[PDB]
Paper text:
Our findings reveal features of the L230 active site and dimerization interface that are conserved in human LHs, show that L230 dimer assemblies are stabilized by Fe2+-binding, and demonstrate that L230 has telopeptidyl LH activity and promotes cancer metastasis. Collagen-like proteins and collagen-modifying enzymes have been detected in numerous pathogens, including mimivirus, and here we showed that mimiviral L230 has telopeptidyl LH activity, increases the formation of HLCCs, and promotes metastasis in an orthotopic lung tumor model.
Fe2+ is coordinated by an active site amino acid triad (His825, Asp827 and His877). An enzymatic activity assay employing bovine skin collagen substrate to measure L230-induced conversion of 2-OG to succinate showed that activity was extinguished by mutation of Fe2+- and 2-OG-binding residues but not non-conserved Ala879. The L230 LH domain formed a tail-to-tail homodimer (889 Å2 interface) through loops in the DSBH core. L230 dimerization forms hydrophobic contacts between a leucine (L873) and an aromatic pocket formed by three tyrosines (Y798, Y801, and Y831) on the opposite subunit (inset, c). L873D mutation caused loss of L230 dimerization and enzymatic activity on collagen but retained wild-type activity on a synthetic collagen peptide, suggesting that the mutant protein’s integrity was intact and that dimerization increases binding of lengthy collagen chains, which leads to increased apparent activity. Surprisingly, dimerization was lost following mutation of the Fe2+-binding ligands or Fe2+ removal, and dimerization was reconstituted by adding back Fe2+, whereas mutation of the predicted 2-OG-binding ligand did not lead to loss of dimerization, suggesting that Fe2+-binding stabilizes the dimer.
Numbering used by the authors:
A (entry chain B): 683 to 750, 767 to 895
B (entry chain A): 683 to 748, 768 to 816, 822 to 895
The structure:
Amino acid sequence: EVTLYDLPTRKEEWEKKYLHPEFLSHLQNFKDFDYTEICNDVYSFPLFTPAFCKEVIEVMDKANLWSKPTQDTQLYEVGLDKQWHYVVFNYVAPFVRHLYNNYKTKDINLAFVVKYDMERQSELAPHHDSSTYTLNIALNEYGKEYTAGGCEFIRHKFIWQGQKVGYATIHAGKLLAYHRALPITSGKRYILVSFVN
Amino acid sequence: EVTLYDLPTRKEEWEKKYLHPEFLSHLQNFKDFDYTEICNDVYSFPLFTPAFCKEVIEVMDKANLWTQDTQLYEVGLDKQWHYVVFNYVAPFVRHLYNNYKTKDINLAFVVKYDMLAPHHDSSTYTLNIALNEYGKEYTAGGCEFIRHKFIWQGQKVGYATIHAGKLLAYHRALPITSGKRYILVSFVN
Ligand SMILES: [Fe+2]
Ligand SMILES: [Fe+2]
């Protein structure tokens, strides 16, 4: 069976297993793609399947390379950098052109999985991202595996919580999307974050 | 007696002759600064005096080093512009855009339109200053913010427009129908 690492060697099997059917079916026509503008210039949309999120979490938990300050692990620390590069420049980049007036994706700054839990507490200060746009994918289920959490978009005066498994949030990195993460109060929360220039 | 090049050696006199009084008198308190949000997250505000704009054009017309443009370093004004951005513009950017810290300057140049594709800028934010008078020295012209669906025409002399460079402010210049149009543009990261 195809794994997370078999992209693009087994690309069509990879897409059917790991890409959300709605996003894959609209790769060449995002006009009718069911995405939501939760606040000005910030969009939520399905991207990956639950199997993608579960397997990403399994790889990260088994590797146990979390930083000892938020608890995260870079995708390249588990050998997924080339697969993530293919994902960004073939799947996400066409959607970014549709959302943001044909903006051309240049390069990837960072990509990592963040693990919020009750054991480690950290300051979640407001900040801008070191990116042109930021991709945030929810990897586990709100309410079932954690409570509270989310993200406050300070400039928009909008709090985004309860993101669905496999659904992504995209927003500007600098200047116009000042934001802070909000702490969980229960369980564990995994997200995939990527800073793209 | 003071010239464009006397910053920051003669800073106090440079500010009075070249910085717009409304901007100069609100450097430490931008809460009462009378700026206009022409469209979402795009702000127009007074920045420079008519003497600054006329002298900048005279430097560029004399140099004749000509998008037909001339970079500020080609006329020895890059250091003066760096002081302007980090000491005057950067505090205003923090007030407008949630304390965003200006990192560095990519480009600074004067554009001359005489007798225009949509694009993103190569910058975090872009500064656009009208250098000569709409209706007197040129007609029509201006800018369209495509994502905002907003036509912006008739910018006053010395007034600046600030907007995001990448992603969120797809724009294009509008053609003029007569005369010449000078603008000072800076791409800031
Ligand atoms: Fe962030
Ligand atoms: Fe431009």
